[PDB]
């Protein structure tokens, strides 16, 4: 139930969108990596930014990025209630007691889905799943405003999420 359609044809690893071009998204949902059987979705975020971050603690960028995202993640809840989030989507992570505790030794404060198959992937509108990490900044009508097929800093998400919060 979207319009998203996701296309990069000149091997560019970071694809941004102006306001006009951008496309909905569906109501992206799964179960809370931290609370078992309590779904997290985006309409639990509405009117906030999104950062939505596909990780693994398997995955060594992942595992870089982490610092970076906590940062984002901090600024983000400060802006503007918070004027965003970042939502991790937690892929390939076949036991929840290991990411759970990946989540907490590193400090982590933002909240993930526990999608061990990458199902969500379906609703990224063609991003590869094989594309770990990918960052993808939501606006405040949680439309596609940049993706990111590599692993970033704060200081570039940063610069496309804060215009967002105060538009
Ligand atoms: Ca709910
Ligand atoms: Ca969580």
Redesign the pocket.
């Known amino acids: 139930g979207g319009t998203f359609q996701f296309h990069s044809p000149d091997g560019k690893m970071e694809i941004f969108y102006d306001e006009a071009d951008r496309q909905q998204l569906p109501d992206i949902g799964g179960d ?4 078992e059987g309590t779904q ?1 979705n985006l309409s639990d975020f509405e009117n906030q930014v999104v950062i939505l971050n596909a990780w693994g603690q398997w995955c060594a960028p992942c595992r870089s990025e982490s610092d970076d995202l906590q940062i984002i993640h901090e600024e983000l809840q400060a802006a503007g209630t918070p004027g965003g989030t970042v939502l ?1 989507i937690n892929v390939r992570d076949y036991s929840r007691d290991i990411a759970q505790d990946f ?1 907490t030794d590193n400090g982590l404060d ?5 999608d061990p198959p990458f199902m969500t992937a379906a609703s990224l509108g063609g991003v590869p799943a094989s594309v770990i990490p990918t960052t993808i900044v939501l606006d405040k009508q949680h439309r596609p405003a940049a993706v990111f097929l590599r692993e970033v800093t704060s200081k570039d998400v940063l610069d496309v999420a804060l215009p967002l919060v105060d538009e």
């Open positions: 809370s990596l931290m609370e997290i991790g989540v933002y909240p993930s889905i526990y």
